[PDB]
Amino acid sequence: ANMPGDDYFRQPPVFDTYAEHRAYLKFRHAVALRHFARLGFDQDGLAGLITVADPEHADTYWANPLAHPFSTITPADLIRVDGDSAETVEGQRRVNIAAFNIHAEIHRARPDVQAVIHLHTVYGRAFSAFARKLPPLTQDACPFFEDHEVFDDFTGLVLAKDDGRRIAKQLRGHKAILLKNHGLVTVGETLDAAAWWFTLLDTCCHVQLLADAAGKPEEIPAEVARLTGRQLGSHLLGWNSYQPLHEAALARDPDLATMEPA
Amino acid sequence: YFRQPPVFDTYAEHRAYLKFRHAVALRHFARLGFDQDGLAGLITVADPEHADTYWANPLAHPFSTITPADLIRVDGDSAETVEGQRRVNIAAFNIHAEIHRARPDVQAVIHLHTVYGRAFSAFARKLPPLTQDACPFFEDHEVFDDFTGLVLAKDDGRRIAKQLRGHKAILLKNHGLVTVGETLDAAAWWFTLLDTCCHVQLLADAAGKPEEIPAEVARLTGRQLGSHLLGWNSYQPLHEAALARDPDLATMEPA
Amino acid sequence: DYFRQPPVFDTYAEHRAYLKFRHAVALRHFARLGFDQDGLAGLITVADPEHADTYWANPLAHPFSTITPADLIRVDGDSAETVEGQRRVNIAAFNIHAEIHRARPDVQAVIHLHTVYGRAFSAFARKLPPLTQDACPFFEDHEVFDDFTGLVLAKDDGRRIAKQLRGHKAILLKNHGLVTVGETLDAAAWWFTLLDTCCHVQLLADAAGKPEEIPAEVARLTGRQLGSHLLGWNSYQPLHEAALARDPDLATMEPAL
Amino acid sequence: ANMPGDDYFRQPPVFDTYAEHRAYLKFRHAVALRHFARLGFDQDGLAGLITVADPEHADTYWANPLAHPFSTITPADLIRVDGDSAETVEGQRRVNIAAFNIHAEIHRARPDVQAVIHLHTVYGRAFSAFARKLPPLTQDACPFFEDHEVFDDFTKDDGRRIAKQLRGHKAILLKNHGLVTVGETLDAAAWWFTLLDTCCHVQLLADAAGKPEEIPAEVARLTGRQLGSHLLGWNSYQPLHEAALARDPDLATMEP
Numbered sequence A: 001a002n003m004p005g006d007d008y009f010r011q012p013p014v015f016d017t018y019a020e021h022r023a024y025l026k027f028r029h030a031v032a033l034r035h036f037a038r039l040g041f042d043q044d045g046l047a048g049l050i051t052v053a054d055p056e057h058a059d060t061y062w063a064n065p066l067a068h069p070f071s072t073i074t075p076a077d078l079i080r081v082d083g084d085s086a087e088t089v090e091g092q093r094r095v096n097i098a099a100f101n102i103h104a105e106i107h108r109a110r111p112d113v114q115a116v117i118h119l120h121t122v123y124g125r126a127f128s129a130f131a132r133k134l135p136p137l138t139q140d141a142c143p144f145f146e147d148h149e150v151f152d153d154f155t156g157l158v159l160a161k162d163d164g165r166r167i168a169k170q171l172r173g174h175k176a177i178l179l180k181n182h183g184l185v186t187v188g189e190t191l192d193a194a195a196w197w198f199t200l201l202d203t204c205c206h207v208q209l210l211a212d213a214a215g216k217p218e219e220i221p222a223e224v225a226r227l228t229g230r231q232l233g234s235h236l237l238g239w240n241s242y243q244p245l246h247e248a249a250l251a252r253d254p255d256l257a258t259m260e261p262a
Numbered sequence B: 001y002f003r004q005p006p007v008f009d010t011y012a013e014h015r016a017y018l019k020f021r022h023a024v025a026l027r028h029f030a031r032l033g034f035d036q037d038g039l040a041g042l043i044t045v046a047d048p049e050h051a052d053t054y055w056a057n058p059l060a061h062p063f064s065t066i067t068p069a070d071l072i073r074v075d076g077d078s079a080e081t082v083e084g085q086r087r088v089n090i091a092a093f094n095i096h097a098e099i100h101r102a103r104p105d106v107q108a109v110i111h112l113h114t115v116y117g118r119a120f121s122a123f124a125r126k127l128p129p130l131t132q133d134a135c136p137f138f139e140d141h142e143v144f145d146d147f148t149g150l151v152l153a154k155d156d157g158r159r160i161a162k163q164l165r166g167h168k169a170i171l172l173k174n175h176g177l178v179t180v181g182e183t184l185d186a187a188a189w190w191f192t193l194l195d196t197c198c199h200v201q202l203l204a205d206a207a208g209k210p211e212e213i214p215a216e217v218a219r220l221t222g223r224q225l226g227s228h229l230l231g232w233n234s235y236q237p238l239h240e241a242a243l244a245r246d247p248d249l250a251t252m253e254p255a
Numbered sequence C: 001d002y003f004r005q006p007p008v009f010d011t012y013a014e015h016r017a018y019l020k021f022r023h024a025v026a027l028r029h030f031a032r033l034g035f036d037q038d039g040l041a042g043l044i045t046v047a048d049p050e051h052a053d054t055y056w057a058n059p060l061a062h063p064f065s066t067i068t069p070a071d072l073i074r075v076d077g078d079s080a081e082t083v084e085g086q087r088r089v090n091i092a093a094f095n096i097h098a099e100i101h102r103a104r105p106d107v108q109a110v111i112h113l114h115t116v117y118g119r120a121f122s123a124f125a126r127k128l129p130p131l132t133q134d135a136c137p138f139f140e141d142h143e144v145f146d147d148f149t150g151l152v153l154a155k156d157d158g159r160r161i162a163k164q165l166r167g168h169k170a171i172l173l174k175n176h177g178l179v180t181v182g183e184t185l186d187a188a189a190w191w192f193t194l195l196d197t198c199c200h201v202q203l204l205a206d207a208a209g210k211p212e213e214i215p216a217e218v219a220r221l222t223g224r225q226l227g228s229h230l231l232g233w234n235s236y237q238p239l240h241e242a243a244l245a246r247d248p249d250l251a252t253m254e255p256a257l
Numbered sequence D: 001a002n003m004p005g006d007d008y009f010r011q012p013p014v015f016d017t018y019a020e021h022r023a024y025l026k027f028r029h030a031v032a033l034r035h036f037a038r039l040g041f042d043q044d045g046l047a048g049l050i051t052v053a054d055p056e057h058a059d060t061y062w063a064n065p066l067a068h069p070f071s072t073i074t075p076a077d078l079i080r081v082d083g084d085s086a087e088t089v090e091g092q093r094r095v096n097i098a099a100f101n102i103h104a105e106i107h108r109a110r111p112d113v114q115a116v117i118h119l120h121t122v123y124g125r126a127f128s129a130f131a132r133k134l135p136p137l138t139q140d141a142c143p144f145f146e147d148h149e150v151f152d153d154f155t156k157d158d159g160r161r162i163a164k165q166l167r168g169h170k171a172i173l174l175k176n177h178g179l180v181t182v183g184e185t186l187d188a189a190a191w192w193f194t195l196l197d198t199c200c201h202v203q204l205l206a207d208a209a210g211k212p213e214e215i216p217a218e219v220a221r222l223t224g225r226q227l228g229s230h231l232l233g234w235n236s237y238q239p240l241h242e243a244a245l246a247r248d249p250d251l252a253t254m255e256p
């Protein structure tokens, strides 16, 4: 309505060639893993995965390889994985096939999505144990209002594609899904937006848990939550919100910063 | 016994001091983790010469890397950047400009989105005088008891400014904390202290049923520890600690 | 093919050098997590591969953050005397570890560190529920030691703990803290790391409300999938590597092969 | 009881000269402040104070000066303060006179005590709001069992009242305020402070999570005797001192 004008926010970049787009994505992919490591989302052993669709090779995805610590990962460590077979088509190492099954099915169900993020975190795990939608407790939780789901089954590791299919079906067109008794998944039209939604979702889980422990807080009414969610929950806002996180992660590691593509 | 805020002979010297302190305060807040909030956080500092214009951190610049040269000067009425190229967060700026207009005594307004501040703000409740450290807020802060989404209309900023009255802080319910100060330093101390007090209150409420300090004691304590002089002085080691962490920024310190 | 396998060594000397290096790095990993703040309380023992009933240990009072392979001491199981090195072990903690080692010839390493979440959860004298997938490795595979008699200054109290542990991967010493074991140091250190985080999650969820646990039959299946030695060993690898990357100086002490 | 023999633990050092003793104490004092800064106990503005009695000059105390951040302090920044007047007798800067009044009265009441520590912390502040003794919830809390008090009022006369309530104990909880510990050495005092804050953290979390069971008094008292002596506190602090040194090579070089 009285939202800022067209030129207020920065726009996601567009690239001439697939190779230029790919170099940009692999760098942002590595930086996002460094950002998540610094938040402590790298402690979960082999559980964490970020997939980014290759712009040129349909139905193949860049991924962090099994067991590589997020804190040291570089673009050259990323592997490209075939969606259907989960086989590595570029690189030597394998992906986490269970996590990858979930991601590939989400990617297949969501052609609009460039990136899927699933990391095992403390606040995310704890909140997921309630099998409950994230309430619109504060303005910052409103981007998820009427735009996330709870996957209300838990059948162990997703070793059958059918489990991935069921998760993707429950996600529908939403930005996030809570795997009950498991943890958070976010998606985005860009890696940047996906990584912002993940960061924000974990912080919202933290806030909700603490407020519930401390007393009986009041949530924002639906009508205001929905308005606020429209204001703050768009791809453009998510992409823009991620930028200082990317930049801050660069400033922290001069070595990674030097690998930024021309 | 206490140090006094400095006096300057020229606007240029005063301005350079303010911009340096402004950037260091952002580095202090980044180190506390208050830089995780995307585009939400804002600190405004009145320019000492140019009435009704305010230095601000620009939209999307990470607090951890910001320098004086990154700060933008923004016109209070239009929210237009009049010095620098980048834009301010116009929603947050609407709140700050209205508070500045309502409070000629205030040099600085701070609003950052934090975990403890967000959580506590969800209760729409004044911060109790639970410990000595919470007493600076006792009978000196308000709750803004409305939430209508982003503050995109100056009128909503006006309402917040009206509710703040002469107080040092206001809790925007279901949103987060705002503090003010006669100096940037005092404002940044109040913000730091308020977040810690929110943390302590939430933990104590979760753990059981704690007892507050009685109002009579709280008010006396609050007078002792809630003055501008105390707030300004309390901030000094925080400024210095932030400097020690970045030698590069430390070299940009004016004389 | 998919998972890596623990290494096999041709000589006791090569095995030993590998273990001491991994032992030091594990202590660096735990320091970084803040599990080094407990004064003298924390202990990791690693069985020597050649010398029966003797154990490498971190020495009393050496900070985890600076420890190197050369600082580790080898301790006799029965006497708790240092047989290699100069310094003494924490004899109370060692009594527990020696008895567990004696009871569990399959175990290479025993880990006991005093942590905030571990201590807090241990105050409830309660098994760790299968609240999330990550807690399932402990499902039907850990015990609670349901006595607390002070420092373990008698072998007999170590015996009681070892008896209650049975064949499990972990035991919660009530009003005290966590102990994990493993067929390798790596797996033991992964179980400890994971156990502490699971204690954290359980405490927060119980504080926040009334969460629902995974049903037993699903928990048991998940626990078999994620609770094997192979999975534990593999899960630890990025933690070892991340600790190395943090200290180039320690990283240079890595043995070859 | 079944406790280790004579030579098992290291002993606090003895010096032949006050000059050597003093240089040792000032170095340890600076390092302890670095240790506490790293724990985040430096966030509390002007609130935090560590006093260390000078070994030679009666009723005078080394202190961190008002408003110097803990993270950067060196031995040369410490000031020596007269107990009675709170005047700086060595150095230029002033101490926090309010906090110092509490410390000086504690020192006066406790000739056995070398060091008094009062820092404002999150878990300490929160737990102190309950005006309740720290229960023997885990082994680690047992050093405080029957060896700490709650000051059941609101903050020289105030210092006197605190010192009276502390009696011969290692710690006192200032209700609705925060923690104080003391020690026969700086090292032991700093260990008790570190440990006390962690114990407050554990107690708060366990009380939030449900209804935990404490160690019975008889076992708590035995455990407290095993782990709550000066010797054990001194020894427990040593890795914390050494770890703090390893973190700052620059401070490490100032070691006497």
Ligand SMILES: CC(C)=CCc1cc(C(=O)O)ccc1O
Pocket: A045, A046, A047, A096, A097, A098, A099, A157, A158, C226, C231, C235
């Ligand atoms: C067995 C396998 C293919 C992968 C291992 C693995 C997967 C996951 C997960 O997807 O949640 C979590 C932890 C973990 O270790």
Ligand SMILES: CC(C)=CCc1cc(C(=O)O)ccc1O
Pocket: A003, A004, A139, A231, A232, A237, A241, B038, B039, B040, B089, B090, B091, B092, B150, B151
């Ligand atoms: C639409 C717009 C002007 C600004 C962005 C923006 C503002 C705020 C806020 O003021 O609370 C929080 C997050 C955020 O992204």
Ligand SMILES: CC(C)=CCc1cc(C(=O)O)ccc1O
Pocket: C039, C040, C041, C090, C091, C092, C093, C151, C152, D004, D139, D226, D227, D232, D236
């Ligand atoms: C008296 C003695 C042998 C050892 C010291 C000692 C042991 C323990 C323990 O095992 O839990 C914890 C702390 C500590 O200081």
Ligand SMILES: CC(C)=CCc1cc(C(=O)O)ccc1O
Pocket: B132, B230, B234, D045, D046, D047, D096, D097, D098, D099
């Ligand atoms: C007025 C004065 C001498 C000191 C100020 C001061 C005292 C205290 C305290 O004693 O608890 C805490 C914070 C603080 O800022």
Ligand SMILES: [Fe+3]
Pocket: A047, A099, A118, A120, A182, A183
């Ligand atoms: Fe998973």
Ligand SMILES: [Fe+3]
Pocket: B040, B092, B111, B113, B175, B176
């Ligand atoms: Fe805001």
Ligand SMILES: [Fe+3]
Pocket: C041, C093, C112, C114, C176, C177
């Ligand atoms: Fe122990």
Ligand SMILES: [Fe+3]
Pocket: D047, D099, D118, D120, D177, D178
């Ligand atoms: Fe105080």
